[PDB]
């Protein structure tokens, strides 16, 4: 990844303004701003062929763009609308021999009428069944993030203060607690399979981390419950020989 | 190789004293494109002078047309001063009214 | 049909040093300029009302963008590749690309590149063909551009797809001015004496359109082989000027006339008899 | 190139060969591209075809036919990591603007040589009568009953890879917010 996108996730109120930053350190002349909606697919918003100039794509309403530096292409929403709720991808390619568009990680934006529907996740780690250990000689830990809105989470497993990827299976599609409702809170689960002997060690510390993206400091909260700000909700567990 | 410009001065209508006319100066067959061309009225440069956009012939030799509206008289003499890198001093071609 | 049969765009990129470069563009119909190019804004200047000719404003904007991106890109890439190609500042790069409608119906497209005053390259069947005047540098250039197939696809699409339908469209859109017939203004004059006891018979022909004309000095029906014809010099408002001279003695001047044959004259030619 | 058609979904068995077909309509062709996009990551460049036809790189192949206006992407000796959306794109003349297709979601079915299905009850680390159910080590199936009760939530099948141990296991998580609930349902 040689193309940077800031922010990664953002929640806005209908009427608010925001600016998406696309940074590239490849000395690429051409830069683009896309929006991905359920197929549909990738739709070009705006594009820049140079440091000074900028041009309109398929859907340029109501987005503003600026290029002041060859390495930065800025997308800007001045009055957010629920239609602009999309996954924004920026890309860059060189003027000569490219032939290849380098995409940024993406920005998931959600424009709501009132920020009162926002909720942080509820995380809990479930210790493996002794039945699995006695059968497969492998122990599986289960993380569970419930009641979160919107789908702005980042689930990560941490073993002995270090992030693990081997034997980790997080749900690709986050579950919806109320399929009938539209403003329904989401649910997500992940699995971590370790060797029985690894779980048997009581010194081994396991922790699943859920990085939630919610309200900003500038946003106002007038409710009798904790502000659902951009936070981390953790759940930990220690190993056991019995 | 660098090519020397060919200057040709002529009128749109026959030379008639009192009646208004147009004086054209067609500079052609030169290379490079950078050239200084001015239309003259008794040695002095004419301010309001219109000129064509840069173009070139089949042999890549550039050609330009400098033209201005004028009222000829028996007393006044007109010319075209052209300066190029292939010229030691600017070439002045006097307009022969024939 | 009479008038122009070919549309082409010209490019003149002047490179002073490794930091300064100026490009000059314009669209033409044979000898008649129909487009201008503002290098500052990177847009086209439509000289005639029909200069867009049957093309949408979207396609014109699309085309203007391709030229804009190319003009800057090429100028900048030439500066970066100047060292490898053993380039010596200052130098001038010229380009001519278009298509022509021939007798029989065929529209043939062309692209020609130049370095200095001499030929450099030509595009033949969407491929870079280096000219002998260009030498090893042209061989090195075409060997490099063949690697960028996509650039040759843009060249192919614009030359063999866009240009033919644009040329046909603009020839109909502007037929009122292109197929137009303008009657020439002809007058006789006396030039500088070509020796003592000899006269200079000058026959001026001005303000005629289309360009094909025929001017000759005649003694009845006899064509004088001594008729020195000039160059078809251009005028504003899309007209032409031609001067035909003849060196003869004082006695020879009597009985001579100047015959002018043009398409606008409708059979009856302009015959101007000499008077002393 | 602006009009691009390709299948919405495609399902294939791990280790087999898949061919994603793409039909296009151009007003000016400048190249055909294939992009891989995982859920929910960014699109990755896969191949570029400017002329007919086949181009190879690793387990992937890409063919183009400008005359017959079509392109196919071949996936030789399929793996689990290949389960992603495959975008078919056509670039416009000349260079800058590229038009992307709707995409083809490729579902890869795991091939297990040791399939021993079982349901396990996992109790919370901290620290009450809350517990979850885990259906694991099964093959294709696909899931014997999914979301049976209104208060019972069952997740989609997840394909595990222990990498260092080289073990492939398919699993699904089940839970109920209301007090006591058996793993049998
Ligand atoms: C109303 C009137 C209208 C008139 C209509 C009539 C029009 C007909 C007239 C004919 C026009 C002919 C103009 C030809 C110029 C087209 C080139 C556009 C370039 C952009 O395309 C190109 C801009 C990059 C600039 C690099 C300059 C390369 C020099 C090669 C050009 C010389 C021509 C080749 C001769 C052998 C681009 O953006 O490159 C980006 C990418 O483009 C891919 O295609 C390529 O594969 C990649 O390598 C590039 O990185
Ligand atoms: C409609 C608007 C009209 C405006 C027209 C704008 C002008 C742009 C059109 C350009 C078409 C001509 C393209 C041919 C130029 C190719 C030049 O190639 C060379 O000669 C390269 C010189 C080698 C340099 C070595 C590095
Ligand atoms: C390049 O040429 C221009 C004038 O045409 C001048 O402004 C500039 O200083 C020159 N650059 C160098 C490095 O000499
Ligand atoms: C070459 O020239 C002509 C005109 O385009 C044609 O017969 C032929 O298709 C061309 N293309 C190739 C690849 O030879
Ligand atoms: C313009 O004219 C030509 C020939 O009559 C035709 O091919 C073309 O479709 C017309 N329109 C456009 C937008 O090119
Ligand atoms: Cl005057
Ligand atoms: Cl040399
Ligand atoms: Cl012709
Ligand atoms: Cl040589
Ligand atoms: Cs591989
Ligand atoms: Na790891
Ligand atoms: Na003469």
Residue numbers in the entry:
A (entry chain E): 2 to 31, 39 to 61, 66 to 72, 74 to 81, 83 to 256
B (entry chain B): 3 to 100
C (entry chain A): 4 to 279
D (entry chain D): 1 to 6, 8 to 32, 39 to 60, 66 to 70, 78 to 84, 84A, 84B, 84C, ...
Task: Please share excerpts from the published article on this structure.
Here we describe the structure of a GEM TCR bound to the CD1b–GMM complex, thereby representing the first description of a TCR–CD1b–Ag ternary complex and sheds light on the general nature lipid-reactive TCRs that are broadly conserved in humans. We refolded the TCR from clone 42 (GEM42) that was encoded by three gene segments typical of GEM TCRs: TRAV1-2, TRAJ9 and TRBV6-2. Like wild type CD1b, CD1b-Ile160Ala readily loaded a natural GMM with an average chain length of C32 (C32 GMM) and bound the GEM42 TCR with a comparable but slightly higher affinity that wild type CD1b. We subsequently determined the structure of the ternary complex to 3.2 Å resolution. Instead, the GEM42 TCR is positioned near the centre of the CD1b platform and directly covers the F′-portal, thereby fully surrounding and extensively contacting the protruding glucose headgroup. Specifically, the GEM TCR bound in an orthogonal orientation with respect to the long axis of the CD1b antigen-binding cleft, whereupon the TCR α-chain and β-chains sat over the α2-helix (residues 151–160) and α1-helix (residues 68–80) of CD1b, respectively. The buried surface area (BSA) on complexation by the GEM TCR was ∼1,600 Å2, of which the TCR α- and β-chains contributed 52% and 48%, respectively. At this interface, the CDR3α loop and CDR3β loop contributed the most to the interaction with CD1b–GMM, with 27% and 35% of BSA, respectively. The mechanism of glycolipid recognition by the GEM TCR is visually striking and can be compared to tweezers, whose jaws are formed by the CDR3α and CDR3β loops, grasping at the protruding glucosyl moiety of GMM. Accordingly, the tweezers-like grip of the GMM antigen provided the molecular basis for the high affinity and strict specificity of this GEM42 TCR for this mycobacterial glycolipid.
